[PDB]
């Protein structure tokens, strides 16, 4: 019980962090696509 | 029959901890490089307008 | 009765197999994240040299 | 030559390319939005 | 704008009976396929497993509207040992363009679902015999179809 609850909470935390990171790297893709050829 | 299952849950928990700190590291690096790329775009536009004027 | 025990063993087996799939998934996630970090290192150095290059070109002008 | 002002047609090479270089961009932004929607990410424009 | 619209629908699962129920509630802010006209929206519900289409269901049509209200309930017979292996695919289509480019947008829930879709699925499985209603941003059909060609 506690093992499953704890693991779920840990997963949820890393999913939050990674969601933020994916937004940031999508900004990165936008900016780098601008600089790719202009 | 159910001990193996909680052992797997234990391993998964540890790896999740490592994935947490990996995600933090790559977040910080993406931030720094993001504003570095901002600087690069500022300098590129500077060369672009300074060429465009003459 | 007879069906309840069978379905019970079924759900148990699927649960264990579920934890095994979790193990595979977090392993492949870890490999992906490591590769991502290495790539961010390489590209970071590349970005340093791009910045230096453009600052040199605008210093020459 | 008396007509040495040759027509530097690079303008139609940097435009027929920057056209494609824009089309491929639009498609890519679709992909980018595809990611944002899939995980439920509001772009920086919101809030 | 460039947005497709949102669909609100409810999910319900009864593990003992193995009954899964999708009530299509409403949709809002649907994108117009063509300019100058308005759509005749309807909704398809595909229950899917291992990338193969099990049962398909359809709502009625609502003419001349971008904000349809449906409240139409569809049920699929899915045993509890299999409920965690399926995917429900919800598509909003323009009946006026049937036979050509149909889809406005679509979404899916269940196995390998992500974001609001996954939290809705899990909400359903965590609240047995209780319908949970949620909104969902429609996603372009090519992206979702790519996502659906992968998982089982």
């Amino acid at each position: 019980n506690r093992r499953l609850q704890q693991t779920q909470a840990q997963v949820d935390e890393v999913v939050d962090i990674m969601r933020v990171n994916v937004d940031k790297v999508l900004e990165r893709d936008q900016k780098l696509s601008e600089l790719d050829d202009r | 029959r159910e001990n193996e299952m909680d052992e797997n849950l234990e391993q998964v928990s540890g790896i999740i901890g490592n994935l947490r700190h990996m995600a933090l590291d790559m977040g910080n690096e993406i931030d720094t490089q993001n504003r570095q790329i901002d600087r690069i775009m500022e300098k590129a536009d500077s060369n672009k307008t300074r060429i465009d004027e003459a | 009765l007879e069906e309840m025990q069978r379905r019970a063993d079924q759900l148990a087996d699927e649960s264990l197999e579920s934890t095994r799939r979790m193990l595979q998934l977090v392993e492949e996630s870890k490999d992906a994240g490591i590769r991502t970090l290495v790539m961010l290192d390489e590209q970071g150095e590349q970005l340093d040299r791009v910045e230096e290059g453009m600052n040199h070109i605008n210093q020459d002008m | 030559k008396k007509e040495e002002e040759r027509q530097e047609a690079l303008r139609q090479a940097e435009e027929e390319r920057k056209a494609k270089y824009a089309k491929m961009e639009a498609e890519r932004e679709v992909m980018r939005q595809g990611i944002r929607d899939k995980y439920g990410i509001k772009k920086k424009e919101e809030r | 704008q460039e947005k497709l619209g949102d669909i609100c629908f409810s999910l319900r699962y009864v593990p003992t009976a193995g009954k899964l129920t999708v009530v299509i509630l409403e949709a809002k802010n649907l994108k117009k396929m063509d300019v100058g006209g308005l759509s005749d929206p309807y909704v398809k519900i595909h229950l899917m497993q291992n990338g193969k289409r099990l049962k398909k269901k359809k709502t009625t049509i609502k003419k001349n509207t971008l904000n349809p209200y449906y409240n139409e309930s569809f049920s699929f017979e899915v045993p509890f040992e299999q409920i965690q292996k399926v995917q429900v695919v919800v598509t909003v289509l323009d009946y006026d363009k049937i036979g050509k480019n149909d889809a406005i947008g679509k979404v899916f829930v269940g196995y390998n679902s992500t974001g609001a879709e996954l939290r809705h699925w899990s909400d359903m499985l965590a609240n047995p015999r209780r319908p949970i209603a949620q909104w969902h941003t429609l996603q372009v059909e090519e992206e979702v179809d790519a996502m659906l060609a992968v998982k089982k």
Binding site: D12, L32 | - | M4, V50 | - | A126
Partner: protein, 54 residues
């Protein structure tokens, strides 16, 4: 009996969560790879230009 039904539900809920996290890591690696090709092209641009000004 109910312990096993509810637990199967939250177990596969954990698996679905982990599969979404996995997808996030995979898409991160894909995007960063593409941007790596981009940065290759960019840097050859500005070094085939910094060798053009020097």
């Amino acid at each position: 009996l109910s312990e096993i039904e509810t637990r199967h539900s939250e177990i596969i809920k954990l698996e679905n969560s982990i599969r979404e996290l996995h997808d996030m890591f995979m898409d991160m690696a894909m995007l960063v790879e593409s941007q790596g090709e981009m940065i290759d092209r960019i840097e050859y641009n500005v070094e085939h230009a910094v060798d053009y000004v020097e």
